[PDB]
């Protein structure tokens, strides 16, 4: 779940508060819709798509699903005791976090006008 996604971000990207990613580009945080403003927005776009596919698994809710993971000594791991849904979600978030750690950060792309550039 997001609390866990939060904690994931905090362990792969220490130097940056997770908030920095809760309202960025067209896909990070807010809804979505439109061409990703950049790579960091692309990471999120791919993260939004991942959730939508997961939503296909019945009774699977990307935001509230509590999965099993762990982050130690710079390693983010999705555990084996997860059902199909939790596993999927975990991996979505996991891929995203790792994606975040490798993408640049443009401050101009933080909290841009969604309505005029993407709703």
């Amino acid at each position: 779940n997001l609390y866990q996604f939060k904690n994931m971000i905090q362990c792969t990207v220490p130097s940056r508060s997770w908030a920095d990613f809760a309202d960025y580009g067209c896909y990070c945080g807010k809804g979505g819709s439109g061409t990703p403003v950049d790579d960091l927005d692309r990471c999120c776009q791919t993260h939004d798509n991942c959730y939508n596919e997961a939503e296909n698994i019945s009774g699977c809710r990307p935001y509230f699903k509590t999965y099993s993971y762990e982050c130690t000594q710079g390693t983010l791991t999705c555990k084996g005791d997860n059902n199909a849904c939790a596993a999927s979600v975990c991996d979505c978030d996991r891929l995203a976090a790792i994606c975040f750690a490798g993408a640049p950060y443009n401050d101009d792309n933080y909290n841009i006008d969604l309505k005029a550039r993407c709703n």
Binding site: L2, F5, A22, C28, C44, H47, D48, Y51, Y63, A96
Partner: peptide, 5 residues
Amino acid sequence: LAIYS
């Protein structure tokens, strides 16, 4: 209380 993605 609120979201990333």
